[PDB]
Amino acid sequence: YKKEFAAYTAALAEAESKKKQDGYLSEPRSQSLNFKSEPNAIRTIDSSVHQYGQQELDALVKSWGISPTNPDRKKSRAYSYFNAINSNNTYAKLVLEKDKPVDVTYTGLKNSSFNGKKISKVVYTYTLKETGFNDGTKMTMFASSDPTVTAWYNDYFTSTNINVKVKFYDEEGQLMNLTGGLVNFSSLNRGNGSGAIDKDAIESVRNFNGRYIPISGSSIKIHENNSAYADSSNAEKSLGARWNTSEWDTTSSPNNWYGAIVGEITQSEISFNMASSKSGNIWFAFNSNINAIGVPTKPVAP
Numbered sequence: 001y002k003k004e005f006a007a008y009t010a011a012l013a014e015a016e017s018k019k020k021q022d023g024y025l026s027e028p029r030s031q032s033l034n035f036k037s038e039p040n041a042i043r044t045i046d047s048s049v050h051q052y053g054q055q056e057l058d059a060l061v062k063s064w065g066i067s068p069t070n071p072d073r074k075k076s077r078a079y080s081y082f083n084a085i086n087s088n089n090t091y092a093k094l095v096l097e098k099d100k101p102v103d104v105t106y107t108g109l110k111n112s113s114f115n116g117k118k119i120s121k122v123v124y125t126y127t128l129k130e131t132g133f134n135d136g137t138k139m140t141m142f143a144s145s146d147p148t149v150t151a152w153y154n155d156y157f158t159s160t161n162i163n164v165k166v167k168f169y170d171e172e173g174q175l176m177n178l179t180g181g182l183v184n185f186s187s188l189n190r191g192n193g194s195g196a197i198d199k200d201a202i203e204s205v206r207n208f209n210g211r212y213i214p215i216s217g218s219s220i221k222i223h224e225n226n227s228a229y230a231d232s233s234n235a236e237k238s239l240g241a242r243w244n245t246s247e248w249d250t251t252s253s254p255n256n257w258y259g260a261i262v263g264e265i266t267q268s269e270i271s272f273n274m275a276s277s278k279s280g281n282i283w284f285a286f287n288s289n290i291n292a293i294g295v296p297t298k299p300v301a302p
């Protein structure tokens, strides 16, 4: 402890003098939240909510006009994207109805803590707010077995906006307030769309009820309604990217800060909106694995 504190102090001094450097947090912070990975979480969804079978969802999506036999290339490409994500049956397959919340509860958490206190349960509430798809009242999403991998959702190359509420609970089942915790909003691609629809696909986070901390040099900027996304392509150097997608957009890439922003938690119920334009399939991971360089973990005194 007394040596981790030394080290953490020295790392904050270093984050301060390098804060204007690429990859560094523009305002130095330490991490007190540990919500990094929970591969063996127990996932529970109320029996109220239909969890689709693979072929059952496939037939539903086809009945919506999104099928391989639609002569409209944009529709059939939306199908092959949907089909790909529909092939993993470890996800819970959900049909969101506009304005109707869906809770996804993960218990049996083995790795997570905040400032020394064990996190034993995380609850996600998903509510479709808007889609450019069909009558605008429905969208597919896929809840991960792992709460830190979190979700895929679709837009079928239109647009989707889904509100997410997140609540963390300790071993006593009491609501926890993760104020000061850092969350990783990562992999917010712009310009990585399908060349058959439009290259300027956009992934964003909107309406975050916490405070963003810009990563220096990152393509992800703050906009109105507390929203974070890139202002131009972060996918192709020929459209002005620093790095092509493949050179930064992985969980271990040393350049992954390029598509990320940090979120500082301010409330016990965390809230943001996942929103996409022209993406087809969208991965949205919610966790504490900060992409910024040199963010120290805050040690806890026994």
Ligand SMILES: [Ca+2]
Residues within 6 Å of the ligand: 186, 187, 188, 189, 203, 283
């Ligand atoms: Ca992404």
